[PDB]
Design a protein around this ligand. Structure first.
Ligand SMILES: CN[C@H]1C[C@H](C)S(=O)(=O)c2sc(S(N)(=O)=O)cc21
Ligand code: MMC
Ligand SMILES: [Zn+2]
Length: 256
């Protein structure tokens, strides 16, 4: 089954998921000089004050912090979006070394990791129905660069010992996502897909311009995780990111 190694990595995915070669695949390189400023793009409205985190899970390719989405508790609206999208989970993609890790790149520059906050469109009623629609999901992507510690990331970093291997999970309540946001909410946006199998083309990507800083030791603990399940040969969870895909005539719009 798919992964990120030599034999099952991004370049092999088309064999089982033919949409890998589709028309609106993500991630893409964001060229700042070709992105078009769009004056009608509204400001983002992130309402995460009533968020309820539940669990953190190692799923064999990243770790997910999951949220209670049975009511409009943590939602995203405004921006390029029509309607309310609920936060269901967030995860990261990171590298083995600080100069690679992000999925989206800006003028070919790669950051150390990328945070994806995944939201689904409430008019479709549940997550499974939202992935059957071209505007079913909105993912908020935030870049991470090594520098000063991000205090709001530390609670996540400390629980990672408990979910070292594939399939382990831990209770993770009362985590507040607002501590992972940069100061500015300027963004680029384009229509894309999930960046892992099943690679469904249902996503409106909102990639924030401003990165958050994390310390070198915060990023180092991400790299101690395992793709493997307990009692198998250890394979460090590093480089779980997909190379950029062809933009193919889509336009990237900027809110600034
Ligand atoms: C296997 N993980 C995929 C299936 C999950 C059900 S999901 O649709 O929540 C997401 S969102 C996501 S990403 N990297 O594009 O943000 C990847 C996946
Ligand atoms: C079409 Hg999702
Ligand atoms: Zn992701």
């Amino acid at each position: 089954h798919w992964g990120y190694g030599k034999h099952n990595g991004p370049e092999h995915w088309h064999k089982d998921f033919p949409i890998a070669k589709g028309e609106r695949q993500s991630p893409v390189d964001i060229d700042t000089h070709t992105a078009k400023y769009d004056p009608s793009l509204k400001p983002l409205s992130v309402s995460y004050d009533q968020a309820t985190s539940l669990r953190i899970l190692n799923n064999g390719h990243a770790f997910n912090v999951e949220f209670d989405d049975s009511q409009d508790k943590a939602v995203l609206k405004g921006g390029p979006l029509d309607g309310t999208y609920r936060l269901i989970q967030f995860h990261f993609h990171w590298g083995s070394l600080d100069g690679q890790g992000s999925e989206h790149t800006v003028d070919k520059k790669k950051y150390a990791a990328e945070l994806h906050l995944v939201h689904w469109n409430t008019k479709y009623g549940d997550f499974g129905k939202a992935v059957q629609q071209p505007d079913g999901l909105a993912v908020l992507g935030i870049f991470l660069k090594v520098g000063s510690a991000k205090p709001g990331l530390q609670k996540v970093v400390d629980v990672l010992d408990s979910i070292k291997t594939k399939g382990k999970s831990a209770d993770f309540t009362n985590f507040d996502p607002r501590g992972l946001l940069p100061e500015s909410l300027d963004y680029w946006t384009y229509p894309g897909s999930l960046t892992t199998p099943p690679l469904l083309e249902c996503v409106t990507w909102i990639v924030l311009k401003e990165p958050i800083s994390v310390s070198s030791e915060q990023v180092l603990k991400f790299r101690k995780l395992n793709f493997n399940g307990e009692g198998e040969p250890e394979e460090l969870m590093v480089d779980n990111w997909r190379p950029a895909q062809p933009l193919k005539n889509r336009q990237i719009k900027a809110s600034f």
